[PDB]
Structure 1
Amino acid sequence: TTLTARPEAITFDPQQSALIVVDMQNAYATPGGYLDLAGFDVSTTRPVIANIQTAVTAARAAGMLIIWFQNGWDEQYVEAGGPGSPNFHKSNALKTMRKQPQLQGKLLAKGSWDYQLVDELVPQPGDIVLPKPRYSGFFNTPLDSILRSRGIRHLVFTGIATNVCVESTLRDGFFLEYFGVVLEDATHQAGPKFAQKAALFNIETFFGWVSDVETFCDALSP
């Protein structure tokens, strides 16, 4: 399949490709979730959910593996690292709970509403649902092994946040020799709008390719 993209069109085989849905949890996409409580704007993520539903339907019907990521930790945050880990000091979820103690245990905690995939996005049999303890899906996980075991070399990225978990996973994919394509209208940034523009610029210019959901779905039709 040829897929129109920036900076140029690319070729991939859907049977040797994977659609990655990054962290489409209430924490990242739903009012009252972690990102909203931490002061990030989540008022614009509703269209992202619908676009991911469309991309997922197309990808699955074309024989692409669907991988869903859930970012987060045990309710006691052992998996987040203690003060000896930079994640303890950088995590805005941990920072939010140190500021608002009534939140403690509620954000990015396995078994919590915050941690669940949003109600609209339901993994199907044959999909893979992967937890991850840090922003990049390629550290501390079996993601690379899962992809290699299926001979997958092309990754189609969707999800939140474009500049954080999405871009980090795509960048690390590039260093592991994966060809990464981000569907720009199926992503949303954490931060001001320039963080979306800059993430896509960095991907298009240095690390991978940028397309969109409709173009992706049209390319998969045959």
Structure 2
Amino acid sequence: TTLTARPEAITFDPQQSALIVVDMQNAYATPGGYLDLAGFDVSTTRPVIANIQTAVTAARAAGMLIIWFQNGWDEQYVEAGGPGSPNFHKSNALKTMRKQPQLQGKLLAKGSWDYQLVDELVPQPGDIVLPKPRYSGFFNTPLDSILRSRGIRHLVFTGIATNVCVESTLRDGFFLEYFGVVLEDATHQAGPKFAQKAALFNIETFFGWVSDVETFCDALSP
């Protein structure tokens, strides 16, 4: 398949490719979730959700592997690292719960509402659903092994946050010799609008390719 993209069009075989849906959890997309409680603007993610559903339908119909990430930890946050991990000190979820003990054990907690995939996005049998304990899906997980076991070299990225979990997984994928493309209108940033712009620029200019959902779906139609 030839996919129109920035900075130029690329080729991939859908049957040797994966669509990765990064962290489409209430924490990252839904009012009252972690990012919202932590002061980030989540009011504009509805079109991102619908666009991911569209992209998943097309990708699965074309034979691409669908991989869903869920970011977060056990309710006791053992897996988040204690004070000896920089993650303990950087996580805005952990910071929010330290400021608001009423939320302690709810943000990004396995089995909780915050951790759930948003209602509109439901993995299907045969999809892979991966928990990850840090922003990048290529650290501390079997993601690389899962992809290599199927000969997959091309990754199409969707999800939240463009500049954090999405971009980190795409950047680390590049260092592991994966070709990564992001569907820009199926992502949303964590931060001001310049964070979306800069993540797309860094991806396009140094790490991978940028396309969009309509272009992706039309490229898959055969």
Equivalent position of 2:51 in the other structure: 51
Deviation at 1:216, TM superposition (A): 0.1
Structure 1 residue ranges without an equivalent (≥5): none
TM-fit CA distance, 1:120: 0.3
Task: Please report how far the alpha carbon of residue 197 of structure 1 lies from its aligned counterpart in structure 2 after TM superposition.
Answer: 0.2
Q: Give SS of 1:67's match.
A: strand
Give the CA deviation at 1:152. Answer: 0.2
Question: SS at the partner of 1:157?
Answer: strand
Kindly provide the CA deviation profile for residues 62-85 of structure 1, in whole angstroms up to 9, marking residues without a partner as x: 000000000000000000000000
Q: Which ranges of structure 2 fall in alignment gaps of 5 or more residues?
A: none
Q: Distance in 1 between matches of 2:87 and 2:108?
A: 13
TM-score by length of 2: 1.00
Q: Aligned partners of 1:221, 1:30: CA distance in 2, in Å?
A: 31
Q: RMSD of the alignment, in Å?
A: 0.2
For 1:167 and 1:202, the matched residues in 2 are separated by 9
Q: Tell me the CA shift for residue 132 of structure 1.
A: 0.1
Q: CA deviation at 1:191?
A: 0.1
Q: 1:106-131, CA deviations, whole angstroms, 9 ceiling, x for partnerless residues?
A: 10000100000000000001100000
Q: TM-score, normalised by structure 1?
A: 1.00
C-alpha distance in structure 2 between counterparts of 1:129 and 1:33, whole Å? 21
Residue 89 of structure 1: CA displacement?
Answer: 0.2
Q: Kindly indicate whether residue 202 of structure 2 is the aligned counterpart of residue 202 of structure 1.
A: yes
SS in 2 for 1:159: strand
CA distance in 2, matches of 1:197, 1:30: 22
d(CA) in 1 for partners of 2:173, 2:158: 14
1:95: how far off?
0.3
Secondary structure in 1 matching 2:144: helix
What is the CA distance between 1:51 and its match in structure 2?
0.0
Structure 1 residue 90: Cα displacement: 0.1
How far does the alpha carbon of each residue in 1:122-155 deviate from its partner, in whole angstroms, 9 at most, with x for none? Answer: 0001100000000000000000000000000000
CA distance in 2, matches of 1:77, 1:185: 32
- Find the counterpart in structure 1 of residue 112 from structure 2: 112
Q: Distance in 2 between matches of 1:166 and 1:37?
A: 21
Kindly state the Cα deviation for residue 156 of structure 1 after the two structures are TM-superposed: 0.1
In structure 1, what is the Cα distance between the partners aligned to 2:165 and 2:111?
21
Q: What is the alpha-carbon distance in structure 1 between the residues aligned to residue 218 and residue 158 of structure 2?
A: 17
